[PDB]
């Protein structure tokens, strides 16, 4: 699962069978690192209009 984002620490406690996380709008906002079983929030980079 690839993408671009800011990977921060997450307070969402996954169940052990779950790997990725989705919001209402079906966008991956939470993920589990495969090396160390920790949960990371994926905040989209700060795009803006100039």
């Amino acid at each position: 699962l690839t993408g671009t984002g800011v990977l921060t620490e997450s307070n969402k406690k996954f169940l052990p069978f779950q790997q990725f996380g989705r919001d209402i709008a079906d966008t991956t906002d939470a993920v589990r690192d495969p090396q160390t079983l920790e949960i990371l929030d994926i905040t989209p980079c700060s795009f803006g209009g100039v």
């Binding site: 690839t2 079906d26 966008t27 209009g49």
Partner: protein, 418 residues
């Protein structure tokens, strides 16, 4: 079942009977009008393609579609601010109420701003604000909710302290039981009726304002017109998001999977399918947003008309400013909307009387100058049309035109001479 339109009401019509009201109800009704929407802006290039440079290189083959979508959304976004500007910014003077709230028994605490609240909103406006709950950006509105509340506070202070004079020029102060009497004369009821029954009218007005607050606090579907606009905008944005998960006939909905699994000659075809699907989705979204923007602009033009004609003046238009004879109206800010509290006069406790078009006296026909001839069975009086106030038929309230041989239904009665 087969539905029923209404209860039958056979009006007791005859050629010489009239019904005259003997009492009145000061009725306050709510009217909720949407003004603006959420200002949404979509980066078309990022929505179709994200950060894929091959996708943007293929998207440049389609020309200036993204420029047209961005310009249409920019036009909608500035149209919402123009709508709010036309609705609420109808005064260039920020009026305040006096610190002493001596309005002859009339209570405006539920509609005036609360100093204890940090948002400086009225209790009704506070309840209204409590009852409303990938390249996408939401532009903030130009007027904040505090400044819209300040505009409504200025309008309320102007219409309380100065009448309709502030809407036509400089604000000329006038006592509120005099303003009310002027409004009574606008609907054709004499000033004396207001002055004699001023305590009852103030009590009815305060009771109606409290019933408005109770009805807003007790009905979940009161603010459904604003909630429908909010739900439509959120559901359209959610549908535009969910259209990204569709492959539109390609092997995958992800551009990175296509660019990593295929060489560019076939990835160009798959990305082209995804581009035309996402472009069709974005064009559909922008078209329905333009249609909803036209609808919201029509509603905001209506709201500006009601602001000008019901709040800044007294309107003779039937059912434009509430049900009944319109007395005044009060504006209240709402999330993306305006709530008009229409204070109207409803006649009540009507009574039958025997009526005649003219009075025959000394071979002359007498017609009422402003009222109507009524009879309780034995004696004839003249009264104003919207309230029972019997007076002796004199030459001061009647006028003479012709003899008694022409008017059909003329009756014989004496006409007093002062």
């Amino acid at each position: 079942y087969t539905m029923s339109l209404g209860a039958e009401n056979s009006v007791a019509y005859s050629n010489n009977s009239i019904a005259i009201p003997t009492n009145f109800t000061i009725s306050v009704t709510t009217e909720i009008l949407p003004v603006s929407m959420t200002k949404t802006s979509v980066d078309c290039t990022m929505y179709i393609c994200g950060d894929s440079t091959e996708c943007s290189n293929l998207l440049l083959q389609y020309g200036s579609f993204c420029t047209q979508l961005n310009r249409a959304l920019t036009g909608i976004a500035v149209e919402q601010d123009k709508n709010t500007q036309e609705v609420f910014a109808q005064v260039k003077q920020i009026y305040k109420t006096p610190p002493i709230k001596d309005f002859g028994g009339f209570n405006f605490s539920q509609i005036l701003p609360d100093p204890s609240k940090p948002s400086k909103r009225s209790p009704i406006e506070d309840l209204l604000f409590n009852k409303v709950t990938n390249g996408l950006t939401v532009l903030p509105p130009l007027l904040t909710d505090e400044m819209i509340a300040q505009y409504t506070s200025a309008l309320l202070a102007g219409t309380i302290t100065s009448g309709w004079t502030f809407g036509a020029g400089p604000a000329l102060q006038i006592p509120f039981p005099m303003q009310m009497a002027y409004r009574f004369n606008g609907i054709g009821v004499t000033q004396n009726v207001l002055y004699e029954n001023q305590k009852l009218i103030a009590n009815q007005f305060n009771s109606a304002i409290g019933k408005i607050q109770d009805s807003l606090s007790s009905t979940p579907s009161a603010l459904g017109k604003l909630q429908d606009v909010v739900n439509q905008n959120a559901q359209a944005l959610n549908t535009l998001v969910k259209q990204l998960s569709s492959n539109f006939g390609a092997i995958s909905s992800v551009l990175n999977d296509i660019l990593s699994r295929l060489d560019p000659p076939e990835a160009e075809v798959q990305i082209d399918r995804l581009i035309t699907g996402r472009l069709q989705s974005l064009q559909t979204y922008v078209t329905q947003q333009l249609i909803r923007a036209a609808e919201i602009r029509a509603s905001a033009n209506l709201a500006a008309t009601k602001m000008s004609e019901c709040v800044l003046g007294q309107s003779k238009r039937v059912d434009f400013c509430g049900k009944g004879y319109h007395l005044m109206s009060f504006p209240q800010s709402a999330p993306h909307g305006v709530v008009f509290l229409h204070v109207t006069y409803v006649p009540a406790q009507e009574k039958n009387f025997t009526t005649a078009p003219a009075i025959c006296h000394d071979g002359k026909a007498h017609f009422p100058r402003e009222g109507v001839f009524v009879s309780n069975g034995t004696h004839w009086f003249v009264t104003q049309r919207n309230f029972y106030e019997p007076q002796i038929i004199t030459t001061d309230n009647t006028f003479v035109s012709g003899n008694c041989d022409v008017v059909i239904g003329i009756v014989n009665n004496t006409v007093y001479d002062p």
